Design a protein around this motif. Structure first.
Motif, PDB file in Angstrom:
ATOM      1  N   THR A 139       0.828  -1.191   0.000  1.00 50.79           N
ATOM      2  CA  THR A 139       0.000   0.000   0.000  1.00 50.79           C
ATOM      3  C   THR A 139       0.872   1.254   0.000  1.00 50.79           C
ATOM      4  OG1 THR A 139      -0.140   0.065   2.412  1.00 50.79           O
ATOM      5  CG2 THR A 139      -1.786  -1.247   1.237  1.00 50.79           C
ATOM      6  N   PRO A 140       0.289   2.411  -0.320  1.00 47.69           N
ATOM      7  CA  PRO A 140       1.103   3.634  -0.421  1.00 47.69           C
ATOM      8  C   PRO A 140       1.801   4.023   0.870  1.00 47.69           C
ATOM      9  CG  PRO A 140      -1.041   3.946  -1.448  1.00 47.69           C
ATOM     10  CD  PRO A 140      -1.110   2.650  -0.710  1.00 47.69           C
ATOM     11  N   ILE A 141       1.359   3.522   2.023  1.00 42.49           N
ATOM     12  CA  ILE A 141       1.943   3.915   3.301  1.00 42.49           C
ATOM     13  C   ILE A 141       2.615   2.720   3.963  1.00 42.49           C
ATOM     14  CG2 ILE A 141       0.313   5.793   3.617  1.00 42.49           C
ATOM     15  CD1 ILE A 141      -1.252   4.011   5.518  1.00 42.49           C
ATOM     16  N   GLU A 142       3.146   1.804   3.157  1.00 44.25           N
ATOM     17  CA  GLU A 142       3.860   0.641   3.662  1.00 44.25           C
ATOM     18  C   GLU A 142       5.213   0.535   2.979  1.00 44.25           C
ATOM     19  OE1 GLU A 142       0.665  -2.121   2.919  1.00 44.25           O
ATOM     20  OE2 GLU A 142       0.762  -2.895   4.971  1.00 44.25           O
ATOM     21  N   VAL A 152       3.209   2.694   8.414  1.00 46.40           N
ATOM     22  CA  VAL A 152       3.601   3.805   9.272  1.00 46.40           C
ATOM     23  C   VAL A 152       2.403   4.727   9.443  1.00 46.40           C
ATOM     24  CG1 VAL A 152       4.489   5.099   7.303  1.00 46.40           C
ATOM     25  CG2 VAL A 152       5.192   5.719   9.620  1.00 46.40           C
ATOM     26  N   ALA A 153       2.095   5.072  10.690  1.00 44.48           N
ATOM     27  CA  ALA A 153       0.982   5.960  11.000  1.00 44.48           C
ATOM     28  C   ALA A 153       1.452   7.406  10.898  1.00 44.48           C
ATOM     29  CB  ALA A 153       0.432   5.669  12.395  1.00 44.48           C
ATOM     30  N   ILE A 154       0.795   8.181  10.047  1.00 47.54           N
ATOM     31  CA  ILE A 154       1.173   9.566   9.797  1.00 47.54           C
ATOM     32  C   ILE A 154       0.442  10.469  10.777  1.00 47.54           C
ATOM     33  CG2 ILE A 154       1.536  11.281   7.998  1.00 47.54           C
ATOM     34  CD1 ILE A 154       2.763   8.508   7.473  1.00 47.54           C
ATOM     35  N   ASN A 155       1.142  11.492  11.262  1.00 46.77           N
ATOM     36  CA  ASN A 155       0.555  12.525  12.113  1.00 46.77           C
ATOM     37  C   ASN A 155       0.382  13.769  11.248  1.00 46.77           C
ATOM     38  OD1 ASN A 155       0.503  10.823  14.311  1.00 46.77           O
ATOM     39  ND2 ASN A 155       2.376  11.646  15.235  1.00 46.77           N
ATOM     40  N   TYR A 156      -0.804  13.916  10.666  1.00 53.18           N
ATOM     41  CA  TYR A 156      -1.057  15.020   9.761  1.00 53.18           C
ATOM     42  C   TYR A 156      -1.026  16.345  10.517  1.00 53.18           C
ATOM     43  CZ  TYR A 156      -2.997  11.072   7.149  1.00 53.18           C
ATOM     44  OH  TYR A 156      -3.188   9.858   6.532  1.00 53.18           O
ATOM     45  N   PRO A 157      -0.721  17.443   9.832  1.00 56.25           N
ATOM     46  CA  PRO A 157      -0.819  18.758  10.468  1.00 56.25           C
ATOM     47  C   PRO A 157      -2.257  19.075  10.829  1.00 56.25           C
ATOM     48  CG  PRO A 157       0.513  18.865   8.477  1.00 56.25           C
ATOM     49  CD  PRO A 157      -0.167  17.538   8.472  1.00 56.25           C
ATOM     50  N   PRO A 158      -2.494  20.136  11.595  1.00 55.32           N
ATOM     51  CA  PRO A 158      -3.868  20.445  12.015  1.00 55.32           C
ATOM     52  C   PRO A 158      -4.779  20.821  10.858  1.00 55.32           C
ATOM     53  CG  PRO A 158      -2.240  21.619  13.353  1.00 55.32           C
ATOM     54  CD  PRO A 158      -1.518  21.076  12.169  1.00 55.32           C
ATOM     55  N   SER A 159      -4.336  21.755  10.014  1.00 55.35           N
ATOM     56  CA  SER A 159      -5.211  22.273   8.967  1.00 55.35           C
ATOM     57  C   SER A 159      -5.596  21.187   7.970  1.00 55.35           C
ATOM     58  CB  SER A 159      -4.536  23.442   8.251  1.00 55.35           C
ATOM     59  OG  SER A 159      -3.510  22.991   7.389  1.00 55.35           O
ATOM     60  N   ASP A 243       9.453  14.100   2.305  1.00 54.29           N
ATOM     61  CA  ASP A 243      10.693  14.612   2.877  1.00 54.29           C
ATOM     62  C   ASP A 243      10.419  15.640   3.966  1.00 54.29           C
ATOM     63  OD1 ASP A 243      11.980  12.965   1.121  1.00 54.29           O
ATOM     64  OD2 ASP A 243      12.593  14.551  -0.264  1.00 54.29           O
ATOM     65  N   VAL A 244       9.441  16.521   3.745  1.00 51.43           N
ATOM     66  CA  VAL A 244       9.146  17.558   4.729  1.00 51.43           C
ATOM     67  C   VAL A 244       8.756  16.933   6.061  1.00 51.43           C
ATOM     68  CG1 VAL A 244       7.583  19.446   5.295  1.00 51.43           C
ATOM     69  CG2 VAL A 244       8.542  19.268   2.991  1.00 51.43           C
ATOM     70  N   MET A 245       7.994  15.842   6.021  1.00 49.98           N
ATOM     71  CA  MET A 245       7.517  15.199   7.238  1.00 49.98           C
ATOM     72  C   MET A 245       8.543  14.259   7.860  1.00 49.98           C
ATOM     73  SD  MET A 245       4.326  16.286   7.785  1.00 49.98           S
ATOM     74  CE  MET A 245       3.779  15.006   8.913  1.00 49.98           C
ATOM     75  N   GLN A 246       9.676  14.025   7.201  1.00 48.13           N
ATOM     76  CA  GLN A 246      10.738  13.174   7.735  1.00 48.13           C
ATOM     77  C   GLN A 246      10.244  11.739   7.929  1.00 48.13           C
ATOM     78  OE1 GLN A 246      12.401  15.056  11.229  1.00 48.13           O
ATOM     79  NE2 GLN A 246      13.068  16.838  10.039  1.00 48.13           N
ATOM     80  N   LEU A 247       9.762  11.161   6.842  1.00 51.24           N
ATOM     81  CA  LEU A 247       9.261   9.799   6.796  1.00 51.24           C
ATOM     82  C   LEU A 247      10.240   8.892   6.061  1.00 51.24           C
ATOM     83  CD1 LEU A 247       5.575  10.705   5.940  1.00 51.24           C
ATOM     84  CD2 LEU A 247       6.385   9.766   8.109  1.00 51.24           C
ATOM     85  N   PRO A 248      10.088   7.574   6.191  1.00 51.53           N
ATOM     86  CA  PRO A 248      11.015   6.663   5.512  1.00 51.53           C
ATOM     87  C   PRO A 248      11.018   6.885   4.006  1.00 51.53           C
ATOM     88  CG  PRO A 248       9.711   5.479   7.132  1.00 51.53           C
ATOM     89  CD  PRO A 248       9.120   6.850   7.031  1.00 51.53           C
ATOM     90  N   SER A 249      12.204   6.759   3.409  1.00 53.88           N
ATOM     91  CA  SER A 249      12.364   7.044   1.989  1.00 53.88           C
ATOM     92  C   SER A 249      11.599   6.072   1.102  1.00 53.88           C
ATOM     93  CB  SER A 249      13.846   7.017   1.617  1.00 53.88           C
ATOM     94  OG  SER A 249      14.599   7.856   2.476  1.00 53.88           O
ATOM     95  N   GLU A 250      11.286   4.874   1.596  1.00 55.53           N
ATOM     96  CA  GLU A 250      10.608   3.886   0.764  1.00 55.53           C
ATOM     97  C   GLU A 250       9.212   4.332   0.354  1.00 55.53           C
ATOM     98  OE1 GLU A 250      12.793   3.365   2.739  1.00 55.53           O
ATOM     99  OE2 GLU A 250      14.036   1.664   2.122  1.00 55.53           O
ATOM    100  N   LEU A 251       8.623   5.287   1.066  1.00 52.64           N
ATOM    101  CA  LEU A 251       7.278   5.730   0.751  1.00 52.64           C
ATOM    102  C   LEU A 251       7.269   6.535  -0.546  1.00 52.64           C
ATOM    103  CD1 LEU A 251       6.015   6.850   4.266  1.00 52.64           C
ATOM    104  CD2 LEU A 251       5.813   4.615   3.175  1.00 52.64           C
ATOM    105  N   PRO A 252       6.110   6.650  -1.194  1.00 51.92           N
ATOM    106  CA  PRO A 252       6.017   7.501  -2.384  1.00 51.92           C
ATOM    107  C   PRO A 252       6.286   8.959  -2.043  1.00 51.92           C
ATOM    108  CG  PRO A 252       4.137   6.017  -2.244  1.00 51.92           C
ATOM    109  CD  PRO A 252       4.854   5.925  -0.938  1.00 51.92           C
ATOM    110  N   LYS A 253       6.693   9.715  -3.064  1.00 52.26           N
ATOM    111  CA  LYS A 253       7.076  11.106  -2.844  1.00 52.26           C
ATOM    112  C   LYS A 253       5.917  11.920  -2.285  1.00 52.26           C
ATOM    113  CE  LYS A 253       9.557  14.861  -3.213  1.00 52.26           C
ATOM    114  NZ  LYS A 253      10.123  15.430  -1.961  1.00 52.26           N
ATOM    115  N   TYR A 254       4.716  11.727  -2.825  1.00 55.56           N
ATOM    116  CA  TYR A 254       3.532  12.462  -2.403  1.00 55.56           C
ATOM    117  C   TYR A 254       2.471  11.487  -1.916  1.00 55.56           C
ATOM    118  CZ  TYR A 254       5.467  16.648  -4.576  1.00 55.56           C
ATOM    119  OH  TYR A 254       6.266  17.717  -4.908  1.00 55.56           O
TER     120      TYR A 254
END
Lengths: 286, 391, 390
Positions: A139-142, A152-159, A243-254
């Motif tokens: 999946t896109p987040i694996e 990986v569980a993402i912590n989205y920004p507030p907005s 990259d901005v969120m500092q996530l593992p590189s294996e994930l898709p760019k967006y």
């Protein structure tokens, strides 16, 4: 002939009425300044009140909140208190009654977006480690690990979280009314998420071994939520940068949270079809 | 938990104080002990109530918090209404000399339960001398369900046999009204989001067939995996049904369920001739009984009241157990232990009648009674073996 | 449990007691003092709060919201008012084969202008006959006139200036909705959920113009339901009739093709139309089979009774579903219901000129056997007498 427009029942023809003008004033018309000066009329009338009531002056301070203006020759009287009461009701209604109505409808909820989801018992299929095998190899987040895939569980920004949850609520509310599972209706259900389904096959089909669909972005911006009773909402971005969120590189760019949520809804809707396939394609902002 | 976010009390009390000074006292603050100080505090108290009033009126319209009356009013606006009480129904056979006139007010009795004709009675007995009627319980409620065959008239009429019999089946279908809380969960379930509502729609619909009591989904033991080691998801729809109030242990013969399947899905299935939508294929299943004996130990030290209830709770738990589901000693021990106390010395064991072997039953090391597919654990007897303590 | 809006007097007393006990230490509120005016102003502020709250909570209720507040909170859920519709119909034109056609054809039947609604071929067919579907230019009920003769608005080389409408039928016109009728059918829609039952598909077909009846494939048709390697049925097909417009209610293939595309979409199998995703189907027509019916002995019944039997029989055959046997028993029953069980009645079915027609056979019992894609159409009913009585 007429020009059809999308609707919950498919393609229908729309129209308009003639203006009536019998609508009671809404929260928007509730202005602090006019309401405050209004209670000067609740006082009695006589030689002890005429002068005081005539010289009433009101001005808006830094942060709104109209306050009486005391000139060099002010004569203290109860009239000052009456204006104070006026400011109170205008303030209390905005702080107390307006939020109650604003949060009572899925199409206008702002602060209680998370609570509303719990009312729909919504569960995402991309966060459970024991996801269905049909959901794709990765999946896109694996990101792949020797002991099988790991998410990986993402912590989205507030907005972005507020906008995404608001959009999800709208689509879920529309679906609860019941629909006929055709392509025209489904697109309308999930359109708040800014996603459109499109089959890959262009020939007759109905005989091939598999039916394939893919998801396209109708826009690169969620429609935000407006707190005030007047004005347009502020749009926000629908994507997240790895990259901005500092996530593992294996994930898709967006990463597009809306697309993932939309994919789950459709998959559940058309489960009874035994040859339904999804081919997700990478997408980037313009 | 509050939905209307309330700023900190200190921030509020400053706001009122600032507003009062700017408007009335012309910028000067309040003396600690005077009329202005007390009126300000009273104003703060009124604000607290205003916040509560607004939240309450928001709470009083949400389905999961509204009052027992407003809840039904909202439900009526979306086509959902509470289920009313039902009357038991069935057929009754009557025999008598031909020609004798009949009456419309006649009623019967089967084990203290009185039934009355629920259809226009004919003018007089037919030539063959046997008549079939449709009857409903005189009073509603579950008490109208009974498994009997022989009855007798309560209002004798000349020329009609003093005794009557029911059909091979029996009277059932009566049920009690629906309370508030069960209604609330049902309404919420409709409003919520759930995948595969088609399965849920069929499951609810099957409960309308006469004599049906419970509907159970496929048990955990019914899962299968192909030779590739990958779980297999079928595209059909299937589930179990029980008749606890009509058949022994609630299991029905194959012929009965076959009729239900045809009505639900049609014949041939999938062409939308039944209640299911177009292009829907499925099958309704049944189950076979496996007997079990349950032995309770260490219950002599308990007071007689505790022993009675503990036995009752276990009996109920086994009765309504789903098919194709394991029965483990832990579940039974926990249920009794929940009443006696976590420190009590309570133990239970499970064994087959006469210690013989049966089809679809295997005992694991831990003492559980593993059960294969299409098999339900049917209680045989509960025995509390005896010892001597406290003397 | 419930708490509601307090009454005026019960509300003022609450404020007066609260104000007196906490600020004045139990002192009474002497009328016409400064505290008296303070108390009454406080009460007014509190009552205006409740009154406004009740006013606003009404607008959220569809059963009482104003019209302008109802178009919204209803367009959000995909329910919109309905504008004036357009009348439709069918036309026929003839001319020299091979003539070049145009996509801007216009017809003027009688004070009404109609425009082509379907795609017109580039050139006229070989047979020199073309049938189109047309719609009025001005929406409203006034487009439902019944005229049979019309003329092309602008001449076109190689094509005659005279056109005809099948049966002069023109249906579909209507007017715009209003506020009150729209309020209903919306709060009624909140209690309704579609399910794709075969009834729904059957009902949806009738919305096509000039359609009267719709039947499933008859007993004499061996349907196919798989259309691929699937385990559950996937295909559905059914007939249609146009009794009031076309002869015998049967339409040429040029029309049923359009219905199939709209209902099931194009390409099929991808839910491009009104049908469900992953469902394929087809709408088909039938070819007429003419029959002649001879009634024996009716001449000795009263003239009033004779007419009833003739009219009832004609109606029954007209409505008969395609691809279904027309047995003698059905006709005989119609006679007995009116003539009485004791009458010497008899019927027989024979083909015109006792010829041979494709798709028609007679069994031993005398009934009429009809194959797929064929219908029993009445050609003539006659009365004969070969017995004596009275």
């Amino acid at each position: 002939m007429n020009v059809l427009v999308p609707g919950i029942d498919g393609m229908v023809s729309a129209g308009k009425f003639e203006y009536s003008g019998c609508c009671p004033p809404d929260f928007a018309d509730m202005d602090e300044c006019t309401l405050a000066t209004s209670y000067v009329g609740l006082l009695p009338s006589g030689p002890l009140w005429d002068r005081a009531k005539y010289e009433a002056i009101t001005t808006i301070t830094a942060t709104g909140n109209c306050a009486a203006c005391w000139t060099e020759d002010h004569c203290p009287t109860l009239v000052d208190y009456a204006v104070n009461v006026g400011a109170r009701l205008a303030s209390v209604i905005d702080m107390t009654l307006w939020p109650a109505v604003r949060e009572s409808d899925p199409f206008t909820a702002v602060t209680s977006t998370a609570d509303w989801l719990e009312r729909f018992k919504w569960v995402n299929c991309f966060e459970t480690s024991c996801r269905s095998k049909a959901l794709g190899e990765i999946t896109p987040i694996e990101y792949m690990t020797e002991c099988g895939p790991v998410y990986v569980a993402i912590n989205y920004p507030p907005s972005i979280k507020q906008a995404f949850e608001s959009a999800l609520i709208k689509s879920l509310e529309r679906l609860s009314m019941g629909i006929i599972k055709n392509l025209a209706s489904i697109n309308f259900v999930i359109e708040p998420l800014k996603v459109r389904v499109v089959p890959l096959d262009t020939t007759n089909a109905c005989e091939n071994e598999t039916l394939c669909v893919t998801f396209e972005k109708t826009s690169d911006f969620f429609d935000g939520v407006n707190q005030n009773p007047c004005g347009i909402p502020s749009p926000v971005a629908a994507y997240i940068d790895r990259d901005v969120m500092q996530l593992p590189s294996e994930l898709p760019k967006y990463i597009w949270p809306g697309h993932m949520a939309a994919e789950c809804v459709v998959r559940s809707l058309l489960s009874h079809v035994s040859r339904f396939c999804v081919v997700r394609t990478d997408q980037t902002p313009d | 938990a509050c939905t209307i976010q309330r700023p900190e009390p200190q921030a509020l009390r400053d706001k009122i104080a600032t507003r009062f000074s700017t408007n009335v006292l012309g910028g000067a603050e309040i003396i600690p002990e005077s009329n202005e100080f007390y009126v300000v505090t009273l104003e703060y108290a009124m604000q607290e109530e205003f916040f509560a009033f607004a939240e309450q009126m928001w709470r009083e319209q949400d389905p999961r918090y509204a009052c027992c009356e407003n809840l039904v009013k909202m439900a009526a606006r979306r086509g959902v209404y509470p289920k009313p009480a039902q009357f038991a129904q069935g057929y009754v056979r009557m025999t008598g000399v031909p020609g004798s006139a009949l009456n419309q007010n006649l009623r019967f009795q089967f084990e203290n339960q009185t039934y009355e004709a629920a259809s226009v009675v004919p003018d007089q007995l037919p030539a063959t001398g046997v008549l079939v009627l449709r009857v409903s319980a005189v009073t509603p409620g579950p008490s109208g369900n009974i498994r009997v065959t022989e009855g007798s008239l309560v209002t004798p009429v000349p020329g009609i046999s003093s005794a009557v019999t029911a059909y091979g089946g029996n009277f059932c279908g009566g049920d009690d009204a629906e309370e508030c809380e069960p209604f609330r969960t049902r309404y919420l379930q409709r409003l919520q989001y759930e995948p595969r509502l088609t399965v849920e729609w069929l499951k609810s619909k099957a409960m309308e067939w006469p004599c049906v009591t419970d509907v159970f989904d496929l048990g955990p033991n019914c899962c299968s995996v192909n030779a590739l080691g990958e779980v297999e998801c079928p595209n059909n729809i299937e589930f179990y049904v029980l008749f606890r109030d009509t058949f022994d242990c609630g299991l029905a013969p194959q012929c009965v369920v076959d009729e239900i399947t045809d009505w639900l899905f049609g014949s041939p299935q999938g062409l939308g001739q039944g209640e299911a939508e177009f292009g829907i294929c499925g099958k309704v299943r049944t189950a076979t009984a496996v007997n079990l004996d349950i032995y309770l130990n260490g219950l002599s030290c308990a007071t007689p009241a505790q022993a009675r209830v503990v036995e009752q709770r276990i009996t109920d738990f086994i009765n309504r157990h789903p098919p194709s589901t394991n029965l483990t000693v832990e579940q039974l021990r926990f249920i009794g232990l929940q009443v006696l106390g976590s420190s009590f010395a309570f133990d239970v064991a499970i064994r087959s009648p006469g210690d013989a072997s049966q089809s679809g039953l295997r005992f694991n090391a831990c003492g559980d009674a593993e059960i294969d597919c299409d098999y339900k654990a049917c209680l045989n007897s509960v025995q509390v073996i005896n010892n001597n303590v406290t003397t």
